[PDB]
């Protein structure tokens, strides 16, 4: 059997988030906290739609990962080590599917990978420029006004 922890984050009412971003208002949403297994780490994803006017990163989807205090923390090694695959799923025809993803190795020297002293680690690890919003107009990433984000963790 396989052993990686995988979470599928469904972000509904996406059109509403886009309108908000275009109105130059912050758009920050988090996935529910999820476990990489049992025992496993409790993590959550953070998605930001950068403002149309953000200079370093205008009109980008930012995607980060945060460690959280989990119920199995006493039975896990720390700091966290492993790889995390972040993917925005193509929901078009299966004939040929091109997901948009990045794979990142954890860096144990960063406090983002230690256990937080509060529910959610203030420090997160990820990509400010994960995917440009214009990319959503090139493939059916949005279906039934929903975006699908996948997170696979390999410890």
């Amino acid at each position: 059997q396989q052993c990686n922890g995988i979470y599928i984050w469904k972000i509904g009412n996406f059109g509403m988030h886009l309108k908000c971003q275009e109105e130059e208002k912050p758009v920050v949403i988090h996935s529910p906290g999820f476990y990489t297994g049992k025992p496993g780490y409790k993590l959550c994803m953070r998605l930001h739609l950068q403002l149309p006017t953000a200079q370093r990163c205008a009109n980008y989807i930012s995607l980060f990962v945060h460690t959280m205090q989990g119920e199995y923390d006493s039975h896990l090694p720390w700091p966290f080590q492993g790889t995390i695959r972040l993917t925005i799923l193509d929901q078009s025809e299966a004939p040929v599917r091109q997901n948009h993803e990045e794979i990142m190795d954890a860096k144990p020297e960063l406090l983002a990978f230690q256990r937080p002293t509060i529910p959610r680690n203030p420090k997160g690890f990820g990509y400010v420029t994960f995917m440009h919003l214009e990319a959503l107009r090139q493939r059916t990433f949005i279906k039934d006004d929903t975006l699908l984000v996948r997170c696979e963790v390999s410890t």
Binding site: E102, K123, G124, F125
Partner: peptide
């Protein structure tokens, strides 16, 4: 290759 980074929110 795009490289991830740590951000303190």
């Amino acid at each position: 290759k795009q490289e991830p980074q740590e951000i303190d929110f």
